[PDB]
Amino acid sequence: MLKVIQSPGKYLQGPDASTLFGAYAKNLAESFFVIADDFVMKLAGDKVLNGLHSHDISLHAERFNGECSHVEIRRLIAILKQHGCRGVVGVGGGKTLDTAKAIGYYQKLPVVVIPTIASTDAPTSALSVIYTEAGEFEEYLIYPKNPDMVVMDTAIIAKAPVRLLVSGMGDALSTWFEAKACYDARATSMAGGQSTEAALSLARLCYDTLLAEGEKARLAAQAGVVTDALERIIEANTYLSGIGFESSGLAAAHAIHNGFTILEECHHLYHGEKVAFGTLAQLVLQNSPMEEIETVLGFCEKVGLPVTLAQMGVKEGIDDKIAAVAKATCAEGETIHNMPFAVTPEQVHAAILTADLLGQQWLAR
Amino acid sequence: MLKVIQSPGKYLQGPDASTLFGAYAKNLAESFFVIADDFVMKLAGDKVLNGLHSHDISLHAERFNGECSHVEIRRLIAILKQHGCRGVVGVGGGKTLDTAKAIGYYQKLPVVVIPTIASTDAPTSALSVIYTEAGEFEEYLIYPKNPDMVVMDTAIIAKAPVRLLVSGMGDALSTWFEAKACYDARATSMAGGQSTEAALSLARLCYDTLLAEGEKARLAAQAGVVTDALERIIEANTYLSGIGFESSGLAAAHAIHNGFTILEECHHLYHGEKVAFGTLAQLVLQNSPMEEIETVLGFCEKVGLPVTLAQMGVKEGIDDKIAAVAKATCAEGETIHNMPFAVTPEQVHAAILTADLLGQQWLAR
Amino acid sequence: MLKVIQSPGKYLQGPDASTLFGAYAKNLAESFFVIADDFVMKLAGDKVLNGLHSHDISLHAERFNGECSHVEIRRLIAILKQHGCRGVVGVGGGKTLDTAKAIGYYQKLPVVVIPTIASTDAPTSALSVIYTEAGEFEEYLIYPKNPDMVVMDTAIIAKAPVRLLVSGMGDALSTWFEAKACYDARATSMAGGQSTEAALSLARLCYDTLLAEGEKARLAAQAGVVTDALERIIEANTYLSGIGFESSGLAAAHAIHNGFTILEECHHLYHGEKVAFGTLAQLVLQNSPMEEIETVLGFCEKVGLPVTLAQMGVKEGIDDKIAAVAKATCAEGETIHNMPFAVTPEQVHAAILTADLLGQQWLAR
Amino acid sequence: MLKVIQSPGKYLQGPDASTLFGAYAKNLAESFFVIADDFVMKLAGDKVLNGLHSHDISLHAERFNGECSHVEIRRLIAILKQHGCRGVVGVGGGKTLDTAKAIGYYQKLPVVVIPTIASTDAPTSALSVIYTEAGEFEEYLIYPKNPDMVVMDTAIIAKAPVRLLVSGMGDALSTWFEAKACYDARATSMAGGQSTEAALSLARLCYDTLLAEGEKARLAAQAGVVTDALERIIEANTYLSGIGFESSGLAAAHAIHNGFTILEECHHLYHGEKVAFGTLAQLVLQNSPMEEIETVLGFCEKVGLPVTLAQMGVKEGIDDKIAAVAKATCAEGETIHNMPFAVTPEQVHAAILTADLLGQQWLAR
Amino acid sequence: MLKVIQSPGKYLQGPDASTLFGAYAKNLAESFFVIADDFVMKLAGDKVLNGLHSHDISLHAERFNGECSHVEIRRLIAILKQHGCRGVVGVGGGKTLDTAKAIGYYQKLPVVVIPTIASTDAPTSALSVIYTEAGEFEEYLIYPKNPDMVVMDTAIIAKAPVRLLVSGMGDALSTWFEAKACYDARATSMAGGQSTEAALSLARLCYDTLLAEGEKARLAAQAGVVTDALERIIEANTYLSGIGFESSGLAAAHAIHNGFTILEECHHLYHGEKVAFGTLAQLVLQNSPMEEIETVLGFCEKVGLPVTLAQMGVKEGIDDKIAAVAKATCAEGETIHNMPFAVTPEQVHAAILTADLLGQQWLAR
Ligand SMILES: [Zn+2]
Ligand SMILES: [Zn+2]
Ligand SMILES: [Zn+2]
Ligand SMILES: [Zn+2]
Ligand SMILES: [Zn+2]
């Protein structure tokens, strides 16, 4: 088999990156179609447009309705065509960025993504999560190409609610364990082959960076301020975790996250918070040693990530609900079959319940 | 002298093992005489019979009265003869399994033992503990042959009361210390010679597995569920501890257990719980270092095993009762004379009292 | 998803074990059919018969023609039937012992094997290598049952040519690496399921024992004498390696050994010598680190095992011959498909040639 | 300079040693003059006499008035002469044993000392502490010869009040630090020269034994019972500490002990308890590292030895009283001048006050 | 079950110790009977007499005939009686010192031993090796009492042939291994009981001192000069090894030494040289790890001690001669039965031959 790794063409990160990226963007296209929701358009949109203008780039800004749907994509494409813009910029959260990727794909245009929050590792991926207009999940669009640019303005990201950065560390904490499980399993990644050592090494660096820098970063983020620990964690959360999942692989943790979406009590939790618990379930599943379980429990408690079912809103009917979560986890096509051993709905149910009891004892010690 | 190790022919372990063992059983005999108490016959008996039938094996199931006595053996043998069954299956607890071994021995038939609980290391041994009909101990029957098969259905074992699995870890915790004491003493085992390195290595693996996996297993067992930590502990409790005691040796811990049976206050405690304290007494007896005493104390407290006389129901008249326990420990034929130094009833009394004080201080720290 | 481990009922080892095993044999049967070639019958046959007689066991000794063939089995069975003997004893090398196993299987009788040489790990297995009368390989007979007894007289084994004990260490050196490769691959063993920790632990102990004791044992064996290092190595070579391969698994090393039997220049080499080189090829195949390659190279050179193609008699036409060896290694049903990654005839050819170059450089340093 | 080490001829230790030492005593003399106070004469005197009689040794037992004075020595000598006894046995505490040494010295007779308590390291020394009849210290008599026998019956010693054994560990804890300070200083010992490595090594073993065995011993002593930890601590307290101080050297700790005898508030404390604090003062004096101070503080707190002035009864007028203790410590002839650096009454005052503050903080943490 | 340690009253060591010991000797007796051979009487006798005279001690010097025989003892006693001397001094080698001990024993007098060579650990022991007038071994006289003084003049010892100091290190190298083997075996020592930790600790210090200081000392001894490495080795060779063997125990090494005295080819070797090889045989016998065998081989080669039979003069008829040496080693009453396992003449033969092969390979590497 071939080893494959993919990457966005360029990844930029630092103070004022949203006003400094024009130099590199100029070489991608002579004009850009910029999208954002109204909140983000007023916060960072006006600065981005002024900066792109200062490098002699023609722009048309347009409002995003808040959902990454096929209808919304086609509506914005129609406006893009009318103006004849040669690139696409997305500014804001996950749904905005994913819509910018789709527009770039269908129009064969270069894509710039400018996350204003560091809460997922989606920004670097050649992936969009497609929703209906009502907000229910529909499908995944996997693209041949990653975004041409990823721009992380850490002055803007620092001022976002601390909870979002913590959810980002929860999403990133899973990367080493799922990557390493795919590596041991010889499981294919989204890149299309086995893992390179490069991708797996960055998966591991992600994890060591969270342990080294996670707490120093969270406190800087709490204050609303930019330190080099936050810079390291933003890179961990975005570039290291992003290359890690796409080119090394997903496994149990993210399958269990998808299993938990069937319970409405978990809908108040962010993507990465559920993944943090799912990682803990994966550790019990692959029988990681106790001091490894304790470092992850210790990390999660310290930063504010859920280590028990109760912290995820599941308080009643546990046996039946976890059985249902376990079945949906092991559904055909799910990433849990990338584990290097046999997984059954019984053994995922087992892992989730034991993980919960490990987290209860830990919080009560 | 010769080095000797003995083993059951085959040891099977996993989910649904009680319905999957027919493939291997078919080669031992064309028909089987299956025994169990009424509780166990309804819980796991009907599945075992259906599974054996599916591999074309003729069966007659018969009720076990609950005591491993000579009278009960002879009653069941008489029924076995009437049906002409070519093998014996025991399903259930210690007394049921030991009766199946005796029947197999006296009739020269192959034996299958199917423990539904993982609370002792007896299942693999060529040993039966014989009782009177009233329930008083009578003698030990040591056989030339181990059971031909040992089948551990971990889905059934997981659902047993957690206390039984913990008592099993208490019985297993003694194996390394008594094995190693017989090895140092050059003391003969039940196998009939000195210890092989194989048997001693498995004795040590038993101990390291308890420390590594014991807590993760207990919580899975608490939830009623099967994890790979429980699988490791069930193997530790059954195969590793079983080969360990029979082919490496018993020593102080089990002699002290036998010493404690003279006190009626200890009759509510299970075999392995008393052995856990007896192991602690052996550590003080052989003067193991403090951090070794602390790892065992720490293990016992954490899982729920007695580290003090009070936790074993001995609250009054301590000096006189421990003196009597000390005398009965050093009785002729007891395994404490396998220690690599001189033991007297005074020095066992000493060890028990000091161990108690070590456990009090530990629980109060 | 069952874990399985199998074992011979009893394994005996020490000085004069061939004259002391009657105590345990008496409980298996009241009479024994003893087989050996003429060389072995005069060396150790007369002592074995006198010892069995001293424990009141009836015997008939019969001559073995030197080949483990279906014809030879049926000839000896016919004589066994005429005398009405209730057990089978084999004394001597691999072909004698394997014929005793077959006789025991087809007649449903207990089996005692008494290896006079410690050159393979076959003695404990439920396996016979069947040959034609001319000496060409025909098939494998895998039995449900292991030998009931394995008796290792280390006074007799010590006096055998040193080369045979060294070939035994070469066969045993492969056990950890193939076991561990099956464990990582989740590959089924001859026992019939996944590996227990017991079997894998003994596989590892085999390897550590060779490194610790291998040189001290070889020199004792050179002198013709019994030390406790030789006792440890005889156990490593027989019990530890035997449980290791049968219940943990075979993989690349033994498949490559089978690949080399197509070259007539290798026919002068013993089983375990070819396995030692095959293990080296497996290390390059699974990309073990250099320090691990160097410990194995260092061990092999020191004891006298081949680390280069030239030491195995392959001097000319290397590219074509190794290509043919590589194809036969990857034949359907071979144990190389138990590796935890994709193996092709190209990558086995690659590994063998690189291993050869590693061994040349090592010998010339 | 010469290196010198001295020792008692024989040191005996174990259960029932006071009734088993007759075999060795028989070779020293054909008759013995035995002394003890009335309490000790009834407790252990009658057994000792019966045991000496059983090895055919003539005896006269005589009462000791309780003080090691010149008057008492001369009174007992006069009675010894009247009976014509050829040896001397002392049974009991320090003052009894020291009087037996003096009698042996002045009469040129062999000496046996039988400590019934393990609270000082005096028993092995060629030293007697001479008092007036009223109980005030008078002088030291240093002898050319050590006791010919030292007999430690650990069954009798175990039953003594726990506080005495703890005071013995306090006296012994000083041995390594004062020995090592004399070794570094090249200071002469009572043996008469520099330290041998033997004596210094035993000084160090004393210290490591207290840390390893001190707590296990104290609890056995609390219960009134004999374990091998108590045996190790009795040897540490008596033989290891005894050879340590006499043949390696005393230094600051014991000088400070002598300094504290000027304060009447300290008269309720035993010799070794004051030495334990004096050792702590020596650590601050020689500027031992913090983790060394913490291991000694930790040891002292755990066993029950004073780490503060208040625990020694000094609660008021601290500055003036410690100044007076500091002057008396640095008096001409004191062992503090064996330190490897300049000591002044100011720097001993300093050390004592800082040590006190280290002990307060430690107890309050 | 008593622990016993014995010692000489005082041990002196340093430059000019033979002229400085009078201070301590004066307190033992008012006059001394001094013995030495003519060589030693002229070398160091005249200085010793002048020094004893300077402390006002009356002396009569008398010539020693060179053999420690009953006849020689009785001849010198008769002269001692005529002069009425109150003590005994021996100056010179082993036979002189042992005769001084016997004279002191039979006359009930104090003993001073002044070894002019550091080649054995006999000087401190309560032991004399008795010979016939012709020089054949007769018996051992074990005394109740050790020498009252042991005086080591390191200026005199330094000038002795280097070979003698090296033989002393060979005798001392065995002490830890035989002591530790008696400790593990719970074997009684010459002191009369089990080992104290003191005696075993000094046994170990002996061994660590040889490895640390042995080479630096040998070169100083080669030059004829006194360094502190030589002082450490003289103490190791005399005090540490002496307390080690007498109060901890002898085992295989010294039994094998006694076994080798039956071969006339070994009569040119000194006591300790044969013990060095015997220690190597003990390592193979107890199966010490390879790295430990290599440190001892490395030490022996470096200093000049035999590691092969050929270096001990055994070149021909090896099998038969080593068999005879093996039988005489295992004779009833020999110290090899203090090993913690079964020893047979076959397994000592085995160990000696394998040790030889280990030493050949080592010298040829
Ligand atoms: Zn994610
Ligand atoms: Zn048990
Ligand atoms: Zn093989
Ligand atoms: Zn003191
Ligand atoms: Zn010696």
Side-chain angles (χ1 to χ4, degrees), chain B residues 3 10 13 198 231-232 235, chain C residues 3 5 13 144 183 198 235:
Chain B
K3 296 172 167 178
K10 287 199 196 72
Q13 182 190 306
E231 294 276 336
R232 301 292 174 80
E235 191 195 337
Chain C
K3 292 170 298 318
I5 181 169
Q13 182 190 307
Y183 184 70
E235 191 200 351

Side-chain angles (χ1 to χ4, degrees), chain D residues 3 10 13 198 231-232 235, chain E residues 3 5 13 144 183 198 235:
Chain D
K3 296 172 167 178
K10 287 199 196 72
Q13 182 190 306
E231 294 276 336
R232 301 292 174 80
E235 191 195 337
Chain E
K3 292 170 298 318
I5 181 169
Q13 182 190 307
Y183 184 70
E235 191 200 351

Side-chain angles (χ1 to χ4, degrees), chain D residues 120-121 171 254 271 275:
Chain D
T120 182
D121 59 358
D171 195 32
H254 267 86
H271 180 72
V275 169

